[PDB]
Design brief:
monomer, protein transport, Ubiquitin-like (UB roll), 25% helix, transport, alpha/beta, 7 helices, membrane protein, 3-stranded mixed sheet, 29% strand
């Protein structure tokens, strides 16, 4: 309550007079806990303290604070791709420079933004780490180490046959910014084969989800310059025409009642064909059979594709498999 004296412990560069000035509580006022917490919020608003705790070790108010250090030194070590000046400019905007208050809850964003700055030049494996050094007058020296990593391969992808998607969208299927391409050292190693398989699956999915049920990959080739590491990919596709959904039939089932079969109607007759919606219907069926005890169920889909009217009818047939035995 009534404060006879105010004491502040923890100050190193901040002066007692300064903190007494910026404190809304004065010696001789009748104070309560809300007003004390509000004074702590006012002191926090200055951004000078990492922590403030108030206690009442007599009829006198005591504030134990932790003064944030001042950045005395900022150095860049093992940095070559981006020069010291550009990193200085990048750090200066988030308040990291010599003569600024070093917030404790800042390290993660320092590392994050400098790593983004490196991922904007092909280095997705760059790792930066900053170490904090103490100095007498509550100052801190920042030791920022950069392991630049290895540069990403530079890709040239040639999408012969594309009239539906822009080359942006097609090239997004090869995921030229993921690190798997790092392990591609020969045109024909296991890693290049897996990357090409996944990329061609993504391309196929792009086309089949937009109704091009006759899409086919005509040819594909992967080549790496064993000189400066460039990856060249060439894929020629045959798109075919777009198709619409026709009639859907669910055969072989004994789990569902007629009305329950419209929880599987996630697409309607006349909609543009979509492979993902068809697979979602498959998954609905598979979940219904699994909940019924059919753990090895599968769904076979027979299409009836008329290229002349451009419509595909679908017959789903359920292969339930063995039911789990109930023990009694």
């Amino acid at each position: 309550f009534v404060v006879r004296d105010i004491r502040v412990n923890g100050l190193v560069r901040l002066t007692p007079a300064n903190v007494y000035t910026m404190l809304p509580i004065n010696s001789g006022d009748r104070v309560n806990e809300p007003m004390i917490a509000e004074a702590i919020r006012t002191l926090y608003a200055t951004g000078l303290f990492d922590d403030i705790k108030a206690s009442k070790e007599n009829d006198t108010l005591v504030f134990n604070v932790i003064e944030r250090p001042i950045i005395s030194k900022l150095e860049f070590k093992g940095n070559k791709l981006i020069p010291k000046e550009a990193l200085e400019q990048g750090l200066k905007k988030m308040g990291i420079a010599e003569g600024e208050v070093f917030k404790k809850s800042a390290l993660q964003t320092i590392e994050t933004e400098l790593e983004q700055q490196y991922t904007q030049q092909g280095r997705y494996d760059a790792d930066v780490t900053v170490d904090t050094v103490a100095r007498p007058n509550n100052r801190v020296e920042l030791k920022i180490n950069f392991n630049e990593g290895t540069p990403a391969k530079v890709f040239d992808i040639n999408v012969i046959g594309n009239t539906v998607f822009k080359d942006s969208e097609i090239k997004q299927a090869f995921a030229v910014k993921e690190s798997g391409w790092a392990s591609v050292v020969t045109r024909n190693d296991r890693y290049a084969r897996e990357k090409m398989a996944a990329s061609l699956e993504a391309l196929r999915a792009m086309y089949l989800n937009k109704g091009y049920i006759n899409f086919n990959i005509n040819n594909s080739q992967l080549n790496i310059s064993e000189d400066k590491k460039h990856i060249f990919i060439e894929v020629a596709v045959d798109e075919g025409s777009q198709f619409k959904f026709g009639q859907t039939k669910f055969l072989g089932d004994a789990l569902y009642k007629p009305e329950e079969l419209q929880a599987l109607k996630i697409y309607k007759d006349g909609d543009t064909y979509s492979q993902e919606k068809v697979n979602a219907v498959k998954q609905l069926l598979l979940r219904k059979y699994g909940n019924a005890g059919y753990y090895f169920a599968d769904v076979n889909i027979v299409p009836q594709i008329n290229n002349e009217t451009g419509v595909v009818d679908l017959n789903y047939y359920v292969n339930p498999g063995q039911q789990v035995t109930v023990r009694r």
